[PDB]
Ligand binder design. Structure first.
Ligand SMILES: COc1ccc(CNC(=O)N2CCN(c3ccc(C(C)=O)cc3)CC2)cn1
Length: 143
């Protein structure tokens, strides 16, 4: 009857580089973390918001992006593990997915960091409304 699985893809990533000169605060690095879809996909169809949970050392460390670009750009002096929550426009479970993102910086001398983490999300028997949103985003029905 109505069994199906819908797969969508998310790309998490970050860039970091050593500043030519530290900030007055002693911030050595510029970095950027993001969540995006692959080319020609619009994840905003199924994503309500992305929450980036910065290290307690940052002011207002809960950074919300309710629309693209889903990204945080900062200057700092150390990497950390960053919880990233991708909230879905889904009425039922699952409502979100959480990733533990390793935001690492390039130690002196080393080239800039430019990392990508590809995540495939499998939704089993999504609702009609949420299935609509997944497929509008470029999601694929399996079997
Ligand atoms: C102990 O382990 C760790 C691990 C990782 C870090 C990284 N943290 C930073 O790089 N920074 C945190 C502090 N920074 C700010 C401080 C103050 C302001 C205000 C008041 O506007 C803005 C920014 C940004 C850079 C730190 N400690």
């Amino acid at each position: 009857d109505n069994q199906c699985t819908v797969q969508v893809r998310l790309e998490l990533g970050h860039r970091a580089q050593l500043r030519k000169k530290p900030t007055t605060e002693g911030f050595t690095h510029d970095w950027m973390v993001f969540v995006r879809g692959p080319e020609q996909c619009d994840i905003q169809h199924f994503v309500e918001k992305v929450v980036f949970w910065l290290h307690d050392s940052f002011p207002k460390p809960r950074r919300v992006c309710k629309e693209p670009p889903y990204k945080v750009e900062e200057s700092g002096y150390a990497g950390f593990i960053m919880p990233i929550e991708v909230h879905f426009k889904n009425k039922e479970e699952p409502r979100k997915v959480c990733f533990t993102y390793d935001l690492f910086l390039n130690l002196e001398g080393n080239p800039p960091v430019n990392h990508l983490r590809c995540e495939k999300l499998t939704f089993n028997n999504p609702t009609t409304e949420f299935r609509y949103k997944l497929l509008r985003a470029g999601g694929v029905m399996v079997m």
